[model samples]
Target chain A: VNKEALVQVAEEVRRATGLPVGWRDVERTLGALRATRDLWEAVRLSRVPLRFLVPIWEGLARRGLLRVEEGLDLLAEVPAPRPGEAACPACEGRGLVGERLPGRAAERFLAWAKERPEAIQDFDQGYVTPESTLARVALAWNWGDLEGKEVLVLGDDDLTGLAAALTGLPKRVVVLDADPRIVRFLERAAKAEGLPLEAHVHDLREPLPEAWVHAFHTFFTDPVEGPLGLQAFVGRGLLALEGEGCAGYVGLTHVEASLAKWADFQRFLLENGAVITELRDGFHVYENWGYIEQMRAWPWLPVKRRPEKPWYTSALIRLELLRRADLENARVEGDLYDDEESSTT
Target chain B: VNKEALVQVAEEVRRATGLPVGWRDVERTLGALRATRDLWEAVRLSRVPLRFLVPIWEGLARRGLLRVEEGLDLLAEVPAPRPGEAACPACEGRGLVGERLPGRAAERFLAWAKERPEAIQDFDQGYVTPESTLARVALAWNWGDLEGKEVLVLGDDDLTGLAAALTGLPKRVVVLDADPRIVRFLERAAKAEGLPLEAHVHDLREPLPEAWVHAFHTFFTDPVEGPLGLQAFVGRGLLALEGEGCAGYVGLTHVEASLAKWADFQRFLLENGAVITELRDGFHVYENWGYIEQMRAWPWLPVKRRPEKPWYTSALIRLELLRRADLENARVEGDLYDDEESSTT
Candidate 1:
């Protein structure tokens, strides 16, 4: 085909689509056709926009170079948007929602959190304010009323014991943590508030206390994202729940974990006879816990500057135990950190 | 834990971070901590921005509440941006790059495309311009020069035959397609251009042509995103390549496929003796394709109004074969459309 002929075709296509198709564009299009033979193949092989091809196809049909039926047939193969595929209600299509903590409740929680001791590095300590802890408690309540329910928090560096106790709901709120500082703080905070809460000093590396096994109505945890860590933390929470209908809430992140990792976790949940009910992305936000200045030590960061805004986020996952606990299958062994020497102490 | 005591601690924390630690903000921080424990976990759990936590952590450490030694240890856990973690050169971190077609070359290809017959729906045709097709061809060349390489296109709707031929760099280019129209067009185009190209009419549902089996050094495809569809198209492409060092390029979309589906696809690739080398998100843009108007037919879409910008995008995936031909293990049956009856015609 000559350049003029190609330009003419391009003009007709432009007219049909109400878009520009310059002579250069037409030449490339013809080059694709000469190489591929079929216009669809030519266009597709050329990597031209599918929308542009609609007009080009129509033009070709008009010129009797392509069958009208074939042109329409090709158009039909293009995917049309389906109506009513509503945006997510919680995130409004952004895939994240902010904490729903009230101003007054937030105020009260921060006041409570101020008395807590500093986080210990050995326990992987970082703290979010009592307000954020309570926000999750509230979510747990919304998912399954916390009122009179036996609630177990598998890890409590954030002092969820105080938040659950403040709710004045759960029949009993129990917190287990490897950190002695957290245990003492929760005990003091709960006593000061005169709320129904208790703290137990126990590492996840150890088995659950005999009295606590299969003793809770529901559980909550912010497990480490590491495969073994997640397995251990989630396993402990599962072991604490008694039977059917007992739900658990967990915080997972995408920063360190990919979809493949999530699939493994999901499979683990399914095999344990639980069904995942919710996966709210970006549900948790972290506050700096005394490490920002040290980030400067690493100069490799694209911006060798400290963060100005909150940067880390986690997805909230909620699952319900549908059957009797499958202890054997849920048991995970060895180190959670994957190091040769376990760091449970 | 009284208001005054809480205020004192908040003041201390505020002094440490040089940021607001108001009762309300503190409450949210506590909420995140309770949900995840550390700022890292909180940000991860909350899905907050990671950069924001740096200053927050630094401030907390500065307050003297957390021991400097412990704070340093915690800082070590924070991910430092690694040197050489450069932004993608092609998309420059945007994950999508535009076509880089040369002016004269683009003109020549378009002129060739104009003479081709219209796309036929039976073949599931959607056309991309030669410019983009050659852009990909160029990328393939950069990955491993196409010079003297035997290239195979599992499906020819994209008309890669012409693009490969245009390069005059490959030893041979072969197209296998289900559409007779495409096959005939490719033959005519190749003959007219005097390029070393061949076309064959073959459906993915059936076995590959005997002579063409394991005959190529590289392959390319834009498979359907459905689990079965991907299996068939990708499986077919894998079967066509000779052995180790054979590379394949495919287009996949997150629009119709979810992360879970991608996980499955990734697993499939691994099991078939190939490792994914590149997965560039949003590398391919689908123009309106006349479907935007049809989208108005559906009401559930989050937005009822037409999109001002093109919304559909596909990712580009590159993989390298790693073993002898695994055609038997890779064989898949059934229709690509998921209908009861197979449609190879």
Candidate 2:
């Protein structure tokens, strides 16, 4: 029952994923799970109706895109319906259910045939808003010196890119996405914002253009697959930067699990002749996030909790200054590439 | 006006002599001349008669066995006859015209000579005694160290070395002289007192043993010459120790003319891998010898005029630790030569 071992495995996951994960992440996630378990225990003590609790909790989970089992495990843990407990007819003793129509009863009953977590939605509160995202992004931008530099955004659309562009410093902002919709949306958003933006819809495998040689003074990019994606992005961007230019990378320094993987990434930068100049926080905090309860009472919750510092987040934005000669000096082997991804490419 | 040039010549004399004649004998002879100079200066200052002063002063000078000019110059510098100065009735202010018989006539003359500086006999109250000789010899010892260490002694020995030695530690002593008699006598005296003594009878020469290789653990030499002597001594010592072991030299570091010389010396040592570890002080104090009345008023007199702590001296000690390889890699230069006098044939 040594939880350290579980955390160790999670760290290996970070290394495989190429993210800087560590113990805090593991502990936070475990604590989050425990908190939910405790909430169910509380509900049982309060004798809440299973039907009412299940539907409401399930709906909340689905809107956040939580797995079905996770939603039910949370909801079902409440005490079973007691023998003396009477069902409330007004709400059908289930806080939520599908509505029926006077003439289309058959089709309406069919719609309620299965309790699907994906279809549920939360009506009570907590949603990640654009303002919240913008604030965090602004903090990261300040941390990374995002203005007056070249930047590349991966996996995400132009929303974050547009926010970053408002700094008015980056000379060029390039968005790379495998999905055509995202690429088109980013271009449209950039036009609407009157910001300079370049959209690239190419697969990661294709070699970049030669004109990118010494093209960027600095780079900013977020990878899709954590460490593996990060390494790919760094390797590609390094090939694109001028000597001594720095690159800002966004991802997990998955502090709770992948400390070693994070250390390796830092070492990789040094060995490649690049020195890391700065690091920004990497986790997010939403309004009314249950921090104190998860940390104090239900310590096994499974969430990457933000640090006590109001500014603290588990997310890492690393800026690495390139030493072009380091590449010449470094004995970079082909083995550094992931076997699975390398094979596919 | 520039006394340093004279001392520089004297150091050169010592260095040249040291190469062939060895250091101990040279220091002995110089030590004697220095002592004789002190007594003569005392005589000149008091406007003392020759008969009263000659017997006592002659004994002091005899300890050094200095040449005629050195003795005469010392006598000449003694303060000139002043108005209202008392004159001896017997022989009436003139030294002995001729030798007289013993008994009654001799006794009357002896009594009168004993009362006058010029007529001072062995039995006179102020006659130079063994106690005074010891004091002068002590002064001689410091001058000897200076000459042997190839530094200079500029002022009267009593006002400087003997005065300082009486109060300071008389651990390592060097007495240099050209006359074998003076060297022998001083050696005997130092041995009688159980003082560590090194005697050299040498002339200063070029390519002198550099500062590091200076033999004494501490150099207590006063500059008999001036800044020129200081420069020559330090410069030569520096060369001698150029790449030798980490020999710690404790000697004076400041002589006005040699400050630039010291700068060069510092650069040379640093360039050759040496570091100055500490600087004790640079204040001035009285040397106690009041031959130069104006000098008595000025404590920070340059190395040329005064050469003792607080006023004239600086103690610089360099530590040169010889490596094991240095010992293992020792090489023989040449066999003992014919110039090795006072050695078994």
Candidate 3:
């Protein structure tokens, strides 16, 4: 594209309207004109903020990219051009199908899901769909992380440890949580099936015990998106790993952590000798929790309506430690779940 | 996991064996110990570098995490744990299947592919499979980049412009390529089909013409991965956009771009007012080109046999501009294809 021409045109318009603009803004305004003859329709389609669009519209007209005739009607004589369906939908875009899981793992996990504890706000606990858990485990299986490895689950509300043990592949599985109910539920399940799984009541706020430190090849956590939450959850998970080549699966949300925070977390992993191998957005769908009215933003809603369907989602990030994770094993304090950007905490 | 205990044990082992050790290294050695009594097998599975592993093994023995029975025999006394099949295999993990593409676009593109020019070394031209092309277009379609959008195909070696036109969705599609054969072929097809698709013979290294600059809503390119190549290909595509809300689909690869380079490229996008929305690794499978022996790495290879199967692949990154791109449009003058990490270029 001719940069000089485009820049000159945008510059001309900028002077005419006094709005900060670029050649791209000019192009999008023109592309929208091609899409519709209606002025407002183009405005909505352009995705440019109305404050900026108002100034650009008049400025472009002055530059002759748009012509106003008979008052409201507008016409354009300009130019333009366009990614998803990225994966198999059968596994919910995860190529690994849970139904095809080995050792009847899917069937057993489904039954366990029916008996698992419901969402409890006391521990900031909400669980992913049963299918999501299976898909997570299926990905681990394909990655060869399940066989002949000791597994650790930092939080077990989702019962990921149980699902991993359901495969009967991992030599041992350890699950820790702040909720005693979850601990009891997992213990009962493990005893009934005689699975090589152990559940304990433990808080993420404290450092992991020596028996578990640097003892796991894999760890799974849905950390709180806040800085402290990331540390208490992901930080602990990393410390639990057996060093190089170990992997971890983490669930982060756009609802809680904005792109700014996402970038920070990504930078954190890389700085600590980790590499993100896979990052799937909108990977986990959560059921509507019962305490919606008691939520942080419920009082400020202009239109208060109880949600009828599942509306929350999170992205799944799979990270592998390329070398030792350089982190401190210190206790974390403060609100681990809430930050300026948090919407659901 | 217990950090103090892990540190003390690793420290004890460190003193006994004189290898820089962590509890994690100790844990992995022990997990390997649990996997098999064989010493060498433990090393292979531990994923620790040999020089470090030998020391850790001996150190763990002194700390009692592992025991040396006779000569080479090893027994473990420690810990460990465990992320794949991410998408649908039917569409090769791309959730959007090419066969189900709208408007018989797939059928039409296939016919044109048979008559298209093959890859030539003169242009560093190698083509992805027809399926990859369709999948790429399908993702664009899913993102609503095709309907009523002026699309730009920075290079037509993959014939993406042709496939996009076949869908009968976009308002117009413009393709620019250095290859005259491609321009003629696309022009011929446009004339025969009466499609709003245009092709031009233009080198990306030079600045875009006035008519094409800042004129498209979306752009697609498979960049060369070198510093200059990214500037020419990806930078040009961004400059052609109409600013905020405009998207670009780019193909990047691990084969040519290492994690170090991937990080650099990712940083580039962020600094240019773009946010990555989706990143799918190994999304494109390239067909074998005729000039493999002439590749940069061919002469240096120890094994001389040419590969029988397709061995090259690329990741697909979908980025949307949050604001105007901060870039320069100066002519690029350097080797745009080859770099130290590039093997096939």
Candidate 4:
């Protein structure tokens, strides 16, 4: 490591933040950067403030010292306070903390997830459950009295169906997915776990099955984040829910979608008679997926190396059906992944 | 304490979050409630998730067991992860953490504020710096090169002028405030501290002073959150800026302002040719203010007791001037604090 360069970075940080930094601080920061193999992990472990790190990372990436993916990965990390360790002075302690599922339930869900089939990229599938999202979803919606409620998992690539069914609270937990592998996995897992889960191999592009139409009390999805893809997947989920008081959960990300797209998505939801209740940023974490590895070969990506850690994340959005579903008027047409394909090209 | 009621709350939490809660959890929650003088603090200290506490607090408040302010206080807290503890698995570790100023700088700020004049209610004054905001502002803008930059504080109840001057970074720091007391305080503080801070007695309802028009590189404010108040304060701030590349910082709270209000604020910024670059939630934490105590008399608030902790917060917003200031087109017409008075009525 160049001592002068590290010292310069420290000076910049001090200048940027008006925080006191000495040779000792510079040494410590350099030690952290030197210790981590990846730039993302270095940021995580760095004691320095993120504002300072941004420039340092950008400088390194610009010089080809660090890959662009590694630099971009910096934006993907979400910082969360440890539960029970500290209380937020501002929120008292209600800190954006989401509750975890009961110990037994969380443990069982993890174990079940361990046996889940590998993801198939043909359907753009990835799994994320050990991250405690299942419990967050249940708690956010007050799933305790789910005894008579019908819940739909529009795209079960994450096996939210199994997690929901494990609660034994909902009357029904139905899953619809284009990938046959995921459908079969849910089926076997549901049978083995004796859950109320039902799986169907159905693509979001098609209309809801007659038996599933207007049938659910709630719906959950980690949809393809493209502008058209998001609307189509969510719109299909709306078709499965009964009107008014019905709720849905969808995951979106700042990494893949811009705020403009988020606004558009929100508008689409409102036009479809759904009202957004909560928009919890960085609510979902996607583990390493096969597609992520492919980015290594892409000429555009600065960092050609495989990321050692999970970097992709999504914000969880909860919306309630306030009026009749407007699926007919809000139907998505043409290619859903317009941006995704264009980026590859 | 009613054991049965406590157990019911615990059971409800378990049902809602699928998190197992035993008698121990119930006893612990009850202990927190009984031990705290402030219901909001009790909720904070309680191990229970806030989702469970909301309804329980509501029930208690409805029965006259808890005051409405205590209940309302719960809504005021912003949850933040503990510093340097666990990394948010999602963001890796780039959580929404804002770096605090160097300990010495922060201490000096606190000392200066200790002997400051009492806040004038007529001006709707509140103090929130030395709690991490000073460092956030400097870091956000990279104050290193503010050598020739003229920065304006549209509303200086927060004492951002003093904080900015302490860095000895900016070329000049000017404060505009309706409150004469604050103006005098900033002037006195500047003289005593030997910092470059200028203060003027000016209400935002008035147009920018001739001497200051199109004179600043940036502006900062914690405006009155009422719909009209925000525009007027921010609009006046814009008038001080030279033009494009000029930036501003404003504090907005979800507690008082809803998303609809936020959208309107953003739209106003866009239409005025400034685009938002950052929206850091839970950015500002207000230390105790007189207005907070007034919440005790609020009839609708559940907790009428004084809060033992600071509960108010605001998201820090950063916007860059993309085009020339548009004070002419975006002029405010009516009373700034219209809603504030209406609420009292």
Give the lDDT of residue A126 in candidate 2.
Answer: 20
Q: What is the TM-score of chain B in candidate 3?
A: 0.76
> Between the candidate structures 2 and 3, which one is better when assessed by lDDT?
3
- Candidate 4, residues B199-225, lDDT tens digits: the string is 999867766768988888778888876
**By summed lDDT, which 10 consecutive residues of candidate 3 chain B come out lowest?**
B76-85
Higher DockQ: candidate 2 or 4? Answer: 4
Interface RMSD of each: 19.0, 49.2, 5.5, 14.3
**CAPRI quality level assigned to candidate 4 from its DockQ score:** incorrect
In the order shown, what is each candidate's alpha-carbon RMSD? 24.0, 36.4, 10.2, 11.8
Ordering by TM-score: 3, 4, 1, 2
Reference contacts preserved by each model: 0.00, 0.00, 0.35, 0.00
Write the residue-wise lDDT of candidate 1 on A1-345 in tens digits: 333655677767667545535443443333344333343334333323333444555565565554433222222211111111112233321222214332234456678777777765466556653534665665565443365578999888777666766756678899998887788888887787777889988878777777888899778898766667876789878888886557788876543443335556766776676655455444565565565444312232212344444544555667766565757434457656532111111
Q: Each predicted complex: what DockQ? A: 0.02, 0.00, 0.23, 0.06
* Candidate 4 chain B, poorest ten consecutive residues by summed lDDT: B76-85
The true-versus-predicted C-alpha distance at residue A140 of model 2, in Å, is 5.9
**lDDT of residue A257 for candidate 2:** 18
Superposed Cα deviation of residue A273, candidate 1 (Å):
0.9
Give lDDT tens digits, candidate 1, residues B1-345: 222433454466557545334332222223344333332233322211122233333443554422233112222222111111112234322222123322233455667667655544455455554544655565565344255678988777667677767756678988888888878888988898788999888777666667867888788887765666765678877888876657788886544443334546766776676655455444454433434333212232211344444444555667766564575634455555542111111
Worst 10 residues of 2 chain A by lDDT: A116-125
Q: Rank the candidates by lDDT, best first.
A: 3, 4, 1, 2
Question: Which residue runs does candidate 1 get wrong by more than 4 Å?
Answer: A1-105, A129-131, A292-304, A329-334, A338-345, B1-345
